[PDB]
Amino acid sequence: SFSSLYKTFFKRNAVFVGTIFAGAFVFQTVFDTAITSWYENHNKGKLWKDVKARIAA
Amino acid sequence: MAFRKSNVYLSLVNSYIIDSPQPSSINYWWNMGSLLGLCLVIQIVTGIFMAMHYSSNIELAFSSVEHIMRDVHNGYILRYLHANGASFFFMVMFMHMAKGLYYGSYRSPRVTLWNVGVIIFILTIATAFLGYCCVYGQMSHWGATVITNLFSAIPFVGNDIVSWLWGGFSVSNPTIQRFFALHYLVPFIIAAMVIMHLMALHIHGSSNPLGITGNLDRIPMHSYFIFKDLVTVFLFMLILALFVFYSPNTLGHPDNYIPGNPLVTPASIVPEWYLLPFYAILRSIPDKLLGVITMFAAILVLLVLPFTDRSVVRGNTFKVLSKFFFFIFVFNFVLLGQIGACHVEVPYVLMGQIATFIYFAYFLIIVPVISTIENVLFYIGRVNK
Amino acid sequence: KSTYRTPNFDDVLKENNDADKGRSYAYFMVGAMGLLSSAGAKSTVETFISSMTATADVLAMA
Amino acid sequence: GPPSGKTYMGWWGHMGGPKQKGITSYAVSPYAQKPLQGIFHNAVFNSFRRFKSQFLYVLIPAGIYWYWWKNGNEYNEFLYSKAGREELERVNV
Amino acid sequence: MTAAEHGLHAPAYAWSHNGPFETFDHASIRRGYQVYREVCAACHSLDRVAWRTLVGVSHTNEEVRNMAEEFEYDDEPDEQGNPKKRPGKLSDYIPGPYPNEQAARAANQGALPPDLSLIVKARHGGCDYIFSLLTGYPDEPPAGVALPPGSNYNPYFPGGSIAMARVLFDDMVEYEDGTPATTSQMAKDVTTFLNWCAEPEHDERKRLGLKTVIILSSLYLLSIWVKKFKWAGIKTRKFVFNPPKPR
Amino acid sequence: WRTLVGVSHTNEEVRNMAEEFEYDDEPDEQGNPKKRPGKLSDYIPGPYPN
Amino acid sequence: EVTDQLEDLREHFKNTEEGKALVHHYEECAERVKIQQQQPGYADLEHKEDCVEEFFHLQHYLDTATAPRLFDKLK
Ligand SMILES: CCCCCCCCCCCCCCCC(=O)OC[C@H](COP(=O)([O-])OCC[N+](C)(C)C)OC(=O)CCCCCCCCCCCCCCC
Ligand code: HEC
Ligand code: HEM
Ligand code: HEM
Structure with missing residues (x-):
């Protein structure tokens, strides 16, 4: 089942660079939101939204 | 024939970066030139996108730099890329020169390449100093006036030259506007000098880490050495991204963020660290005119290095004594840069004098003696008469 | 040594020289x-x- | 164009090297090979061989200059204490 | 030189922002702005910090707008010609307490208090030095030293004698949240606020650094692999030389 | 005022004409601003303050 | 009910075996310099002995003992 994968993805270069660009789209967006979610959960209570909810409650 | 070999611009790009025959056995030290070209393009690009916001008055220089740091979008990135890529530029340049004077590529078919490289080194020291005196901090202004007061030690002509260079009577608004114009201008002379470096290389081909002829089996540039350059470019980008994002101010002095006040002296007027060995060579001998001419002799005494090497084998790869004395010279250069950061004090003045004597004696005294000794040792160990 | 007898490559080779698998x-x-x-x-x-x-001062004074 | 002066490197086909005969060169395409072949064996053994052959030339001058710098620095820190001020004047003049 | 003229080296404290992944404590930035406004606003200017950078970091927009009304600013004059004064909006800068530098030297015995907008970035040691300078005032200088009149002793100041008296006393301010205001608590809060106002790019810089070094280290590993792939045909070529027959 | 010497008036005449205007000097020991008579380096003053 | 934590921590580290020895050296300084200051002819001696060596040693020991614990004690 590797011949079908090679035929539909890496045979012609146009679908190769199109796959690379669409993967760049979805990778950049989910990588950005995942790394900012981790960076804002590693600091809990130190961010401004947490301080604002703390002084609002 | 092919279109990449027929068209006139593409034939140049082909013959330089596609199928330029490089020797088959070059290691990772030969990628420092590609790294220097990339980092020069990085410096020029971030410099243009900072000079679109930098205003070069005396009332607006440091305020405009901290306006870049605080208000323009991603300006902290641009300023830290410039101020750290200059340090990385000089460290990769020091690696380039040390590779060149270790592997014997100052030798008989590329002495004009070595001389053009020394010209590039002088020009980039000059524009790096001008860029450091654009920002107008406390190290900046006083380092400028210290080395121009150094430059006024010429006997008949010196005060007239230094009050032509200042644009006045001390380092002020005309000096800072002058230094911004020159700090823009000189890297576009370095770009032409790097084009000259590439031509003077390409007429003869690169050396290999053995000394022997690369002309037997060579390798085209495109599918192999571009990817070796890609490995070292991504490693250099990783180390540069670390030094830009996680500790940006761990290289520069923590006194350049005080605004330039020409009344107070900060009691330690050291420059940025790549000028520290030449500053130690300067502060070695107590007189001043002799100090600046021995700093200039310390810079252009790399030109006597092709004419003073008497070894019949190219490079220190298959030598022992010259390997030992070359690493003595390198750690002496690092010690000289360490001495240039301290005050003129109790072992430091004698250590600076002895270190600059060992620096000046590696090129003039030590290397023809040990090269002659190694030649005679090779002959009397080989032949049996 | 003959010029038709190749030296060994059996350590640097793989057992399955599939075109599609290795190319993919x-x-x-x-x-x-x-x-x-x-x-x-x-x-x-x-x-x-x-x-x-x-810059942020221009956006402030917008 | 102008045929300039001859150098010690031509181009592909006439590279200016010596004439060779009888040197057969066998190679294998990387798609038939395994990259990362022997990276742990050559990471433990060959790297130790290179470090064993080329570390005295680096560590003896580094040791000399580091001991000189450490001795000078601790002598300066001795002198600008209180137990060296008579030595400070004697070294001054 | 001597360690008295060098200044005693500040220790290595355990900050809440020391590290590659940690950030500023924004509640400490709010309390440090309160300590700056109630204590350090009498001498020290803070001019490169606009009011609008404070929004979304330590106070809300309504709090910063109600804080900026308390200060007069020079307006462009009216139709008659004489100058006018206006209450400040968000785009203005935090005003200094002295109109020029001669008044700052006249009200503080000839010593100019430096601009605090870049004071943890333009000092050796940084926030450790600022905290130890604020707290490490001894009650009397040690036996033997002589100070000029009007100059106090602080060992972390390089020189020994600083012109700034010990100002951070116990319960000088009272925090609006309930934190007990010692002098060490006020010192830590005001040096965290000075760290913020010297580098406001801290959070975004460390976040983009995490992104960039993850992407670049993965690119470095993939490029090492593709280099070994492209050179697998050259690392493993074999040369065979049989000697040719003579002619 | 220094461009005016050697062209239309002499140096003493321009130095006597520059005294009739007051200019902003940097403030003294107390901090309050002072005024000074003009010298040859200052510009010719306009009649309206803004 | 609450005052400084840093002064409490320095007072706690001024009673260790190392701290009492460094403190004792500093008051050997203190009374030696006081006796030397009491003497006539102190307007000019060419070397007026202060005591900052012992105070710097004491403050350096106190700060290298105090640096980890204080920010855990604070809020
Ligand atoms: C501009 C100078 C500074 C910027 C300078 C940048 C560096 C210098 C330019 C490098 C640009 C690289 C472009 C590569 C063009 C290309 O041929 O891509 C094809 C590759 C795969 O090609 P292959 O490995 O030969 O395989 C083909 C064989 N099949 C699979 C068909 C059987 O497919 C891929 O490579 C995947 C797509 C990756 C996209 C490239 C990422 C970098 C883009 C930079 C673009 C810069 C040019 C902008 C021009 C306005
Ligand atoms: C006067 C009524 C002051 C108050 C309240 C504060 N400071 Fe101060 N400071 C003042 C003067 C006159 C000086 C000059 C002394 C000198 O010679 O520099 C200073 C100095 C500082 C410094 C500089 C130390 C250095 O190494 O340059 C800093 C970092 C400083 N002051 C900070 C500071 C803080 C954080 C304060 C309150 C929370 C504070 N000062 C109060 C005058 C006065
Ligand atoms: C040869 C390459 C260059 C080097 C080595 C270099 C080096 C430097 C250095 C070290 C500084 C001081 C940074 C600091 O304050 O610490 C600087 C400042 C500066 N350089 Fe360059 N520079 C180079 C090219 C350029 C070019 C070509 C430009 C213009 C397009 C430029 C624009 C600036 C500007 C505007 C500053 C002002 C201060 C700042 O914002 O960083 N640089 N340069
Ligand atoms: C702006 C800085 C520079 C750039 C961009 C640059 C660029 C290059 C490049 C691309 C190469 C070919 C790759 C290589 O052989 O390593 C090279 C080779 C060389 N450069 Fe430079 N160079 C610079 C500065 C210098 C300096 C300062 C010197 C020394 C004075 C120098 C001397 C050499 C030598 C001797 C070689 C030949 C190395 C060999 O073939 O063995 N260069 N340079």
């Missing part, structure tokens, strides 16, 4: 490098031309 593996690796470098080149270009937009 190599092209997936070069495509992953191209994907990461594409996202990086996009982000640094938009960094450089996001510097040239309106």
